[PDB]
């Protein structure tokens, strides 16, 4: 067949990573162990852990654009209100 | 030479291909159209309408 | 007897690869349609504007389409009203519904001839030989059913269409004699135009395409041979290597 | 390496049409494949631009094709190039299906390439048949009734399939409106089967007329068979241009220009010239169920052909009698399509039985026994 | 040549090209009536006018209208007013012969339109468009 | 597909029978030159298909000399065929040079592969 | 990067495919969504007025427009399906990435029986939320004005596109 | 990449044919030779050669089915002729 | 069958207003079932002061 280019992945046998030595793996057949073994204590304690870490990365970025839209919505409500047409004519 | 002016550069070789094909569109169209009307003189609409005089 | 008599090949002026329609015959054929075969046949697929610049002049066609009437959009209170025809409208047939056609013609349905030339085997030769192929009496041995006329070219023999073409039933605008053979040559020309209004342009675009493609086809053979020249004359020799190795 | 071989998208083009090694001695019969690829593009491109002006309702189906021919700019070029390219598509395909049978192209290791061709052969018959009923001509209505009512011979199930296929009790609006939407789909399936067809052609390559190994002398596809294919492209587009501009309605039938009528039948219901011969195989059997089995078998008999041929030589080139009976079978098919043009009358019925018998016996008796003596004449003639 | 044929087929067909011009009568259009005709798939607000509102159109200053154009340029024969119906802001249909200047009043965003078709009171960007129309005797072909 | 040993046991019997070897062999020899492969320089055994494991085995046991010459006749036939001509009359294959050089290798390879399939289905009593 | 650029091409063709299929219904919102979007190319100087007239097939949105919008809408998904094939061809040379952003060639597991059955988890959850929007609230995401037949004379109160555009 | 099957073709470098040795090739550039050099004497003498070889393979196979269709066509013409209805009724 | 033959005759009886077809009104006016009900019972005896 025709030759091909140079990539960053191989296949089973020549995957292309570094040579490894001195690392051992153990596993057990799933017919011999019980799944669902720790679903509780993971739905409570594990989820709370992850939440407490990544929640100020989403809240403050959502805490800025909520007060920015609200002070524009409650400002647009006064500009088109009967008490805020005089400010409307100076911005229209 | 004639080669040095036209066929040496592929930029100007294809330019005169397009330039010659530009002229051929209109010259060939008029050449075929005139013979076709000449071979069928006395039958076309402009000859019947001209007969009404 | 039941296939219908084969009609011969006549000398039509538009046969051949370079001939156009005789546009004087399209103008005359339209006149003998309007007064002879307009009563019982339709032409539903012909707009009025296609006649401008082919058979009649623009002021001539804007007046022919105004003798008829078309249904207009309703008035201010939804009542229907009529309008005169314009150049965007089509030629109206003689009958409103398919039932009213069969009533006037003894139950027979007269076809729409906007495509008759390409829809009856026998091309232009079958329409011409139809209207002039009527014997004065049926051949000995056959007694026709009442109300039907004999015509050998018709497959099966017996037909329901009578004779409509006589002599001097129409007067032309250019003094041509109005013989039965003359008109039958003209309607087939006008009807072939109706089925193929692209006739002339198709045959001149073809001449352009054939000349371009036939010289492209020849130029390609030279280029094919020029590029294949190194393999056509390639020569092989064979000298057996020694069996020492 | 070069960019045409390094890029992910340009390396597929490189190995199929540029650097592909071809036998150095294939003649003009091997140009037929690229002509079918050219014609597949013609049907699709001239169909997408013509599908912008077609209505699939039973009310507007016929009227819209006239609007294409009279109102669309160059609309007559679209419809003659598409109606005549369908007929030219089958003539090149028969010459592709016959060159394969002559040079023994069906033999191993190319049996899958042979079976994928038969699948392609059927889908094209359906695609042409489906697009034929789209016009809703008088011939297309009754060509639809006869072909679709053919499955009423399968016992105990036929009456429901026919009613399911029609979408009702006969050929009416539900039939045409679903025939067109299918007609737009199947060419995209053929285009996908051609991709699978060229995938099985690439593992072993093309064959050569000598029927021997071709790995000794190869030349690249580009600049040799790219410019030799250009010779037949211009000749194919010239004969097609003659049938489109100078005689557009020669191959078709004039009865298709009548609007379809459910009350009055035509004088003679005949299929197009490419389905004409199988129409005689169907009509030779004096039974309804047995006709369908016999009609469809003629396509399926080609499948056993890699097994019946008992010869140790591919092709008919160096065989006097195997080359001899081939042309009778060629002509018998040419004769087979001749009776289907004639009515069911004496003595065309008797011709219709013997001719279709010799058609089937070529695969099942003559090709296996002549191929057998030929192995013996070859053996004692040299010994 | 091949590309031109395929692309050309996409271009307008003979019947659509034919519907391009509509003529309207010089007597049938009444005085206090608004003809709203669908011409080329677009609305057109025709109004056969009175000889009194011509001074009313050019009455206001050019500061009350952001596109400066008088009545005589927006309509040639002042006995008519033929206006393109697509409003310059969004494209709404102003109410017919109801408003404050004798012309039109858009109810969508309050753009007042005069008898000449300009804006008077409103945030609309331009005066309203006038189509092509030419008198030929008893008719005038808009478009 | 009709093997080769099958059609060879047909041969050696017809050869030995005086009535048969007089009736058909004088008819077979015209079938060879009418086929006309000799004129392009082809020995018969170069015509058999080789895309199966039986012929691929015999093509490997073939000696170097008969494999080099076999390469040249196929190349010459490919070259001559594309020119739509034939070889000169003085280079054609005669009657005596067309010998069975690929016969024994095909036969010794099928009888060793017939044995394999007859041993994979032994029903021991 | 090629896997990234092929995605942007796929992104555009899907916007057109959804926009084209939106005008097929010929609702009041689809007529005016067609006018506004197609009249957008009238800003290209000296050429825009001809392209717009060429795209409409006439002088506005009428029969020539819808009849060619549908035939295009049936074609483009077959082009997306062909671009997805080219999209997975550029994904196969280097493979997927991982959330750590580091090399993934040290620990690999086969696609079958691991990510075939993990994909089955989201397939059933996707077909369950879709089943709620189809059987229990079908018209929540759409706009009610699309149920009016398209009218060339009267504009809607507010021409708004779908939530994704 | 994943392993593939066994085929009967290779590529440029390993095409898969037998080893060859002792065969030499000569060629000349097409810029230096005249094409169309022998088109005559090939359109006359070469074509006649090929025709005389393969023309009884096509004629006799076409010479059998032409007389078979004609004696059926001119027999069907008599069976449906006024003089051949009496034979028609015995075959109908 | 509806009450009027053509769109012009509908506008004549109802002062120029075009009364819509209600085979799809529920999914075509924002306000769903709540807007049709509150329409026919939401009429004050007099308009609010100022209008
Ligand atoms: C409150 C959140 C509670 C979960 C939690 O631990 O909070 C932190 C947790 C973040 O944990 P992390 O380990 O820091 O990051 C998650 C990782 O992305 C790792 O992602 P993952 O493997 O956990 O899966 C993420 C997500 C995967 O969710 C999806 O991708 C949604 C699939 C929807 C399919 C159908 C879509 C149909 C169209 C749209 C409707 O599924 C979950 O979050 C499952 C949590 C049990 O929050 C979430 O992930 C909330 C996701 C909600 C959806
Ligand atoms: C009288 C025939 C005169 C020619 C001649 O030498 O007679 C014997 C000659 C046989 O010579 P051969 O060397 O024994 O066998 C020819 C080989 O197949 C070798 O084939 P080839 O390379 O000679 O090409 C065969 C054919 C190739 O012709 C085609 O494949 C036709 C291509 C048509 C393309 C467009 C098709 C459109 C749809 C159908 C319309 O073209 C020719 O025969 C050219 C002859 C100059 O007869 C023909 O080949 C007649 C073919 C007529 C077509
Ligand atoms: C139909 C085409 C079917 C495949 C081609 C075929 O059957 O051609 C056979 C014959 C000549 O083919 P050959 O292979 O014999 O030519 C080389 C001779 N040395 O071709 C002919 O005899 C001419 C066939 C013309 C049709
Ligand atoms: C007197 C009425 C009448 C006139 C006038 C008339 N026809 Fe007919 N024509 C008929 C009828 C009725 C039929 C149907 C007969 C049937 O098919 O048996 C018919 C059938 C035909 C057919 C169909 C024949 C076919 O084989 O099916 C053609 C073609 C035709 N007419 C052509 C013409 C032409 C051409 C003209 C004049 C230019 C003409 N007709 C004038 C009454 C007329
Ligand atoms: C291999 C592919 C195709 C074949 C063989 C094919 C064949 C045919 C044939 C035989 C007809 C009838 C022609 C006639 O007698 O008038 C037809 C009609 C038609 N085909 Fe196709 N077709 C193909 C692909 C397509 C595609 C892809 C489309 C659309 C995208 C298409 C659209 C049409 C239309 C609209 C008609 C009816 C128009 C007309 O013929 O007047 N076809 N086709
Ligand atoms: C659109 C339809 C088709 C296309 C585009 C197509 C294309 C090709 C191409 C390019 C080749 C290789 C070049 C050649 O051998 O000439 C080929 C080979 C072949 N095709 Fe097709 N084909 C099509 C349909 C079919 C059909 C319908 C059959 C059989 C019924 C078939 C059977 C074959 C066979 C046997 C070969 C091998 C020929 C050889 O190697 O000598 N094909 N095809
Ligand atoms: C029908 C449309 C699409 C399909 C079926 C599709 C399918 C896929 C699949 C199966 C993968 C590998 C699995 C995965 O990464 O989750 C993938 C990867 C990717 N796709 Fe798409 N895709 C589509 C559209 C797009 C679009 C529109 C974009 C960008 C605008 C895009 C950008 C990507 C990228 C960047 C990746 C690599 C992700 C990674 O390896 O981490 N794709 N796509
Ligand atoms: C002319 O005889 C026919 C025929 O009448 C029909 C209906 C079909 C089948 C055609 C269809 C109605 C659609 C089915 C086609 C497919 C290949 C299915 C593809 C999609 C799933 C044929 O293939 C066919 O030729 C044998
Ligand atoms: C919503 O805005 C639009 C849009 O209005 C149009 C017309 C198109 C283009 C759509 C067409 C009318 C067809 C052209 C589409 C192709 C990709 C061509 C494919 C075939 C050749 C868009 O891609 C698009 O999104 C940016
Ligand atoms: C073995 O030797 C070979 C060989 O290997 C190959 C590959 C070929 C070459 C043959 C082929 C590859 C044929 C391939 C055929 C196809 C796959 C059919 C192609 C199908 C399509 C392109 C699909 C349809 C898609 C379109 C064309 C869409 C076009 C877009 C349109 C019309 C939209 C236009 C609208 C606007 C808005 C402008 C040979 O000829 C050959 O022998 C010489
Ligand atoms: C699938 C549909 C087609 C089937 C395949 C048939 C092959 C024909 C393709 C034509 C390409 C030939 C030119 C190659 C090239 O680029 O050579 C280039 C330059 O050659 C030229 O001068 C080009 C000549 C122009 C002719 C092209 C006309 C095209 C006709 C339409 C064909 C398809 C519809 C490479 O030249 P080289 O030989 O030096 O490498
Ligand atoms: C299937 C056949 C397709 C043939 C046409 C595509 C050829 C593309 C060649 C350019 C290329 O690969 O450049 C790509 C970038 O392409 C894109 O951004 C979008 C390509 C979309 C193409 C849609 C048709 C760059 O390729 P890159 O530089 O990574 O080279 C890889 C091997 N060295
Ligand atoms: S449409 Fe003119 S202001 Fe809203």
PDB file of N, CA and C in Angstrom, chain A residues 8-66:
ATOM      1  N   UNK A   8       0.421  11.101  15.816  1.00  0.00           N
ATOM      2  CA  UNK A   8       0.708  11.028  17.243  1.00  0.00           C
ATOM      3  C   UNK A   8      -0.103   9.940  17.940  1.00  0.00           C
ATOM      4  N   UNK A   9      -0.440   8.876  17.218  1.00  0.00           N
ATOM      5  CA  UNK A   9      -1.077   7.702  17.793  1.00  0.00           C
ATOM      6  C   UNK A   9      -0.713   6.496  16.943  1.00  0.00           C
ATOM      7  N   UNK A  10      -0.595   5.338  17.585  1.00  0.00           N
ATOM      8  CA  UNK A  10      -0.390   4.101  16.865  1.00  0.00           C
ATOM      9  C   UNK A  10      -1.602   3.196  16.930  1.00  0.00           C
ATOM     10  N   UNK A  11      -1.377   1.923  17.224  1.00  0.00           N
ATOM     11  CA  UNK A  11      -2.455   0.956  17.381  1.00  0.00           C
ATOM     12  C   UNK A  11      -2.041  -0.014  18.478  1.00  0.00           C
ATOM     13  N   UNK A  12      -2.819  -1.075  18.665  1.00  0.00           N
ATOM     14  CA  UNK A  12      -2.513  -2.071  19.685  1.00  0.00           C
ATOM     15  C   UNK A  12      -1.193  -2.745  19.345  1.00  0.00           C
ATOM     16  N   UNK A  13      -0.153  -2.427  20.110  1.00  0.00           N
ATOM     17  CA  UNK A  13       1.167  -2.977  19.883  1.00  0.00           C
ATOM     18  C   UNK A  13       2.237  -1.919  19.699  1.00  0.00           C
ATOM     19  N   UNK A  14       1.885  -0.802  19.070  1.00  0.00           N
ATOM     20  CA  UNK A  14       2.809   0.293  18.792  1.00  0.00           C
ATOM     21  C   UNK A  14       2.138   1.640  19.023  1.00  0.00           C
ATOM     22  N   UNK A  15       1.461   1.788  20.166  1.00  0.00           N
ATOM     23  CA  UNK A  15       0.621   2.960  20.407  1.00  0.00           C
ATOM     24  C   UNK A  15       1.390   4.275  20.359  1.00  0.00           C
ATOM     25  N   UNK A  16       2.693   4.262  20.622  1.00  0.00           N
ATOM     26  CA  UNK A  16       3.497   5.455  20.455  1.00  0.00           C
ATOM     27  C   UNK A  16       3.824   6.219  21.717  1.00  0.00           C
ATOM     28  N   UNK A  17       3.545   5.662  22.890  1.00  0.00           N
ATOM     29  CA  UNK A  17       3.931   6.299  24.125  1.00  0.00           C
ATOM     30  C   UNK A  17       5.351   5.960  24.516  1.00  0.00           C
ATOM     31  N   UNK A  18       5.771   6.484  25.663  1.00  0.00           N
ATOM     32  CA  UNK A  18       7.099   6.150  26.184  1.00  0.00           C
ATOM     33  C   UNK A  18       7.157   4.717  26.690  1.00  0.00           C
ATOM     34  N   UNK A  19       8.375   4.180  26.721  1.00  0.00           N
ATOM     35  CA  UNK A  19       8.591   2.852  27.275  1.00  0.00           C
ATOM     36  C   UNK A  19       8.354   2.875  28.778  1.00  0.00           C
ATOM     37  N   UNK A  20       7.594   1.906  29.275  1.00  0.00           N
ATOM     38  CA  UNK A  20       7.267   1.826  30.688  1.00  0.00           C
ATOM     39  C   UNK A  20       7.744   0.503  31.267  1.00  0.00           C
ATOM     40  N   UNK A  21       8.140   0.544  32.536  1.00  0.00           N
ATOM     41  CA  UNK A  21       8.728  -0.601  33.212  1.00  0.00           C
ATOM     42  C   UNK A  21       8.650  -0.359  34.711  1.00  0.00           C
ATOM     43  N   UNK A  22       8.270  -1.390  35.461  1.00  0.00           N
ATOM     44  CA  UNK A  22       8.139  -1.265  36.897  1.00  0.00           C
ATOM     45  C   UNK A  22       6.780  -0.829  37.389  1.00  0.00           C
ATOM     46  N   UNK A  23       5.749  -0.918  36.552  1.00  0.00           N
ATOM     47  CA  UNK A  23       4.388  -0.544  36.920  1.00  0.00           C
ATOM     48  C   UNK A  23       3.529  -1.795  36.794  1.00  0.00           C
ATOM     49  N   UNK A  24       2.822  -2.146  37.863  1.00  0.00           N
ATOM     50  CA  UNK A  24       2.021  -3.362  37.912  1.00  0.00           C
ATOM     51  C   UNK A  24       0.553  -3.018  38.143  1.00  0.00           C
ATOM     52  N   UNK A  25      -0.337  -3.847  37.596  1.00  0.00           N
ATOM     53  CA  UNK A  25      -1.782  -3.619  37.623  1.00  0.00           C
ATOM     54  C   UNK A  25      -2.472  -4.850  38.210  1.00  0.00           C
ATOM     55  N   UNK A  26      -3.498  -4.620  39.027  1.00  0.00           N
ATOM     56  CA  UNK A  26      -4.344  -5.696  39.527  1.00  0.00           C
ATOM     57  C   UNK A  26      -5.808  -5.406  39.222  1.00  0.00           C
ATOM     58  N   UNK A  27      -6.568  -6.459  38.927  1.00  0.00           N
ATOM     59  CA  UNK A  27      -7.988  -6.314  38.637  1.00  0.00           C
ATOM     60  C   UNK A  27      -8.722  -7.566  39.091  1.00  0.00           C
ATOM     61  N   UNK A  28     -10.032  -7.429  39.281  1.00  0.00           N
ATOM     62  CA  UNK A  28     -10.891  -8.520  39.727  1.00  0.00           C
ATOM     63  C   UNK A  28     -12.104  -8.589  38.808  1.00  0.00           C
ATOM     64  N   UNK A  29     -12.528  -9.814  38.503  1.00  0.00           N
ATOM     65  CA  UNK A  29     -13.654 -10.022  37.608  1.00  0.00           C
ATOM     66  C   UNK A  29     -14.930  -9.410  38.181  1.00  0.00           C
ATOM     67  N   UNK A  30     -15.718  -8.731  37.346  1.00  0.00           N
ATOM     68  CA  UNK A  30     -16.967  -8.130  37.835  1.00  0.00           C
ATOM     69  C   UNK A  30     -18.043  -9.144  38.186  1.00  0.00           C
ATOM     70  N   UNK A  31     -17.884 -10.410  37.802  1.00  0.00           N
ATOM     71  CA  UNK A  31     -18.802 -11.440  38.273  1.00  0.00           C
ATOM     72  C   UNK A  31     -18.583 -11.759  39.743  1.00  0.00           C
ATOM     73  N   UNK A  32     -17.460 -11.328  40.310  1.00  0.00           N
ATOM     74  CA  UNK A  32     -17.082 -11.672  41.670  1.00  0.00           C
ATOM     75  C   UNK A  32     -17.196 -10.509  42.642  1.00  0.00           C
ATOM     76  N   UNK A  33     -17.574  -9.324  42.178  1.00  0.00           N
ATOM     77  CA  UNK A  33     -17.726  -8.165  43.041  1.00  0.00           C
ATOM     78  C   UNK A  33     -19.099  -7.539  42.842  1.00  0.00           C
ATOM     79  N   UNK A  34     -19.496  -6.800  43.877  1.00  0.00           N
ATOM     80  CA  UNK A  34     -20.850  -6.218  43.904  1.00  0.00           C
ATOM     81  C   UNK A  34     -20.846  -4.785  43.409  1.00  0.00           C
ATOM     82  N   UNK A  35     -21.430  -4.481  42.244  1.00  0.00           N
ATOM     83  CA  UNK A  35     -21.562  -3.075  41.864  1.00  0.00           C
ATOM     84  C   UNK A  35     -22.539  -2.377  42.795  1.00  0.00           C
ATOM     85  N   UNK A  36     -22.667  -1.066  42.606  1.00  0.00           N
ATOM     86  CA  UNK A  36     -23.522  -0.240  43.458  1.00  0.00           C
ATOM     87  C   UNK A  36     -23.052  -0.295  44.910  1.00  0.00           C
ATOM     88  N   UNK A  37     -21.778  -0.631  45.107  1.00  0.00           N
ATOM     89  CA  UNK A  37     -21.270  -0.893  46.448  1.00  0.00           C
ATOM     90  C   UNK A  37     -21.199   0.366  47.302  1.00  0.00           C
ATOM     91  N   UNK A  38     -20.917   1.517  46.703  1.00  0.00           N
ATOM     92  CA  UNK A  38     -20.808   2.737  47.475  1.00  0.00           C
ATOM     93  C   UNK A  38     -21.562   3.914  46.897  1.00  0.00           C
ATOM     94  N   UNK A  39     -22.749   3.678  46.331  1.00  0.00           N
ATOM     95  CA  UNK A  39     -23.492   4.778  45.721  1.00  0.00           C
ATOM     96  C   UNK A  39     -23.910   5.802  46.768  1.00  0.00           C
ATOM     97  N   UNK A  40     -24.402   5.356  47.920  1.00  0.00           N
ATOM     98  CA  UNK A  40     -24.505   6.259  49.052  1.00  0.00           C
ATOM     99  C   UNK A  40     -23.112   6.524  49.611  1.00  0.00           C
ATOM    100  N   UNK A  41     -22.966   7.676  50.269  1.00  0.00           N
ATOM    101  CA  UNK A  41     -21.685   8.203  50.738  1.00  0.00           C
ATOM    102  C   UNK A  41     -20.866   8.715  49.558  1.00  0.00           C
ATOM    103  N   UNK A  42     -21.357   8.491  48.342  1.00  0.00           N
ATOM    104  CA  UNK A  42     -20.852   9.166  47.157  1.00  0.00           C
ATOM    105  C   UNK A  42     -21.833  10.189  46.612  1.00  0.00           C
ATOM    106  N   UNK A  43     -23.132   9.931  46.744  1.00  0.00           N
ATOM    107  CA  UNK A  43     -24.147  10.905  46.369  1.00  0.00           C
ATOM    108  C   UNK A  43     -24.286  12.030  47.383  1.00  0.00           C
ATOM    109  N   UNK A  44     -23.639  11.923  48.536  1.00  0.00           N
ATOM    110  CA  UNK A  44     -23.734  12.914  49.597  1.00  0.00           C
ATOM    111  C   UNK A  44     -22.385  13.565  49.870  1.00  0.00           C
ATOM    112  N   UNK A  45     -21.389  12.773  50.257  1.00  0.00           N
ATOM    113  CA  UNK A  45     -20.106  13.333  50.658  1.00  0.00           C
ATOM    114  C   UNK A  45     -19.207  13.661  49.474  1.00  0.00           C
ATOM    115  N   UNK A  46     -19.220  12.828  48.431  1.00  0.00           N
ATOM    116  CA  UNK A  46     -18.353  13.077  47.284  1.00  0.00           C
ATOM    117  C   UNK A  46     -18.848  14.260  46.462  1.00  0.00           C
ATOM    118  N   UNK A  47     -20.161  14.350  46.245  1.00  0.00           N
ATOM    119  CA  UNK A  47     -20.703  15.454  45.459  1.00  0.00           C
ATOM    120  C   UNK A  47     -20.476  16.793  46.150  1.00  0.00           C
ATOM    121  N   UNK A  48     -20.654  16.837  47.472  1.00  0.00           N
ATOM    122  CA  UNK A  48     -20.411  18.071  48.211  1.00  0.00           C
ATOM    123  C   UNK A  48     -18.961  18.512  48.102  1.00  0.00           C
ATOM    124  N   UNK A  49     -18.041  17.551  48.087  1.00  0.00           N
ATOM    125  CA  UNK A  49     -16.611  17.906  47.918  1.00  0.00           C
ATOM    126  C   UNK A  49     -16.438  18.650  46.593  1.00  0.00           C
ATOM    127  N   UNK A  50     -16.835  18.038  45.477  1.00  0.00           N
ATOM    128  CA  UNK A  50     -16.602  18.626  44.163  1.00  0.00           C
ATOM    129  C   UNK A  50     -17.295  19.974  44.030  1.00  0.00           C
ATOM    130  N   UNK A  51     -18.510  20.092  44.571  1.00  0.00           N
ATOM    131  CA  UNK A  51     -19.244  21.352  44.497  1.00  0.00           C
ATOM    132  C   UNK A  51     -18.508  22.482  45.205  1.00  0.00           C
ATOM    133  N   UNK A  52     -17.990  22.225  46.407  1.00  0.00           N
ATOM    134  CA  UNK A  52     -17.325  23.273  47.170  1.00  0.00           C
ATOM    135  C   UNK A  52     -16.051  23.752  46.482  1.00  0.00           C
ATOM    136  N   UNK A  53     -15.442  22.917  45.640  1.00  0.00           N
ATOM    137  CA  UNK A  53     -14.250  23.333  44.907  1.00  0.00           C
ATOM    138  C   UNK A  53     -14.606  24.237  43.730  1.00  0.00           C
ATOM    139  N   UNK A  54     -15.377  23.718  42.776  1.00  0.00           N
ATOM    140  CA  UNK A  54     -15.772  24.492  41.602  1.00  0.00           C
ATOM    141  C   UNK A  54     -17.195  25.022  41.770  1.00  0.00           C
ATOM    142  N   UNK A  55     -17.330  26.062  42.593  1.00  0.00           N
ATOM    143  CA  UNK A  55     -18.579  26.821  42.612  1.00  0.00           C
ATOM    144  C   UNK A  55     -18.398  28.330  42.648  1.00  0.00           C
ATOM    145  N   UNK A  56     -17.219  28.846  42.980  1.00  0.00           N
ATOM    146  CA  UNK A  56     -16.939  30.268  42.827  1.00  0.00           C
ATOM    147  C   UNK A  56     -16.411  30.605  41.440  1.00  0.00           C
ATOM    148  N   UNK A  57     -16.085  29.595  40.634  1.00  0.00           N
ATOM    149  CA  UNK A  57     -15.758  29.769  39.227  1.00  0.00           C
ATOM    150  C   UNK A  57     -16.985  29.987  38.359  1.00  0.00           C
ATOM    151  N   UNK A  58     -18.173  29.670  38.865  1.00  0.00           N
ATOM    152  CA  UNK A  58     -19.406  29.778  38.106  1.00  0.00           C
ATOM    153  C   UNK A  58     -20.349  30.810  38.710  1.00  0.00           C
ATOM    154  N   UNK A  59     -20.254  31.049  40.022  1.00  0.00           N
ATOM    155  CA  UNK A  59     -21.230  31.909  40.685  1.00  0.00           C
ATOM    156  C   UNK A  59     -20.928  33.386  40.461  1.00  0.00           C
ATOM    157  N   UNK A  60     -19.715  33.823  40.780  1.00  0.00           N
ATOM    158  CA  UNK A  60     -19.325  35.219  40.593  1.00  0.00           C
ATOM    159  C   UNK A  60     -19.412  35.599  39.116  1.00  0.00           C
ATOM    160  N   UNK A  61     -18.927  34.781  38.172  1.00  0.00           N
ATOM    161  CA  UNK A  61     -19.199  35.073  36.755  1.00  0.00           C
ATOM    162  C   UNK A  61     -20.677  35.122  36.411  1.00  0.00           C
ATOM    163  N   UNK A  62     -21.536  34.424  37.152  1.00  0.00           N
ATOM    164  CA  UNK A  62     -22.977  34.573  37.017  1.00  0.00           C
ATOM    165  C   UNK A  62     -23.535  35.609  37.977  1.00  0.00           C
ATOM    166  N   UNK A  63     -22.726  36.090  38.918  1.00  0.00           N
ATOM    167  CA  UNK A  63     -23.181  37.088  39.864  1.00  0.00           C
ATOM    168  C   UNK A  63     -22.983  38.499  39.355  1.00  0.00           C
ATOM    169  N   UNK A  64     -22.204  38.635  38.287  1.00  0.00           N
ATOM    170  CA  UNK A  64     -21.973  39.934  37.669  1.00  0.00           C
ATOM    171  C   UNK A  64     -23.008  40.223  36.592  1.00  0.00           C
ATOM    172  N   UNK A  65     -23.358  39.217  35.796  1.00  0.00           N
ATOM    173  CA  UNK A  65     -24.272  39.431  34.683  1.00  0.00           C
ATOM    174  C   UNK A  65     -25.732  39.340  35.106  1.00  0.00           C
ATOM    175  N   UNK A  66     -26.001  38.973  36.359  1.00  0.00           N
ATOM    176  CA  UNK A  66     -27.374  39.022  36.846  1.00  0.00           C
ATOM    177  C   UNK A  66     -27.726  40.398  37.394  1.00  0.00           C
TER     178      UNK A  66
END
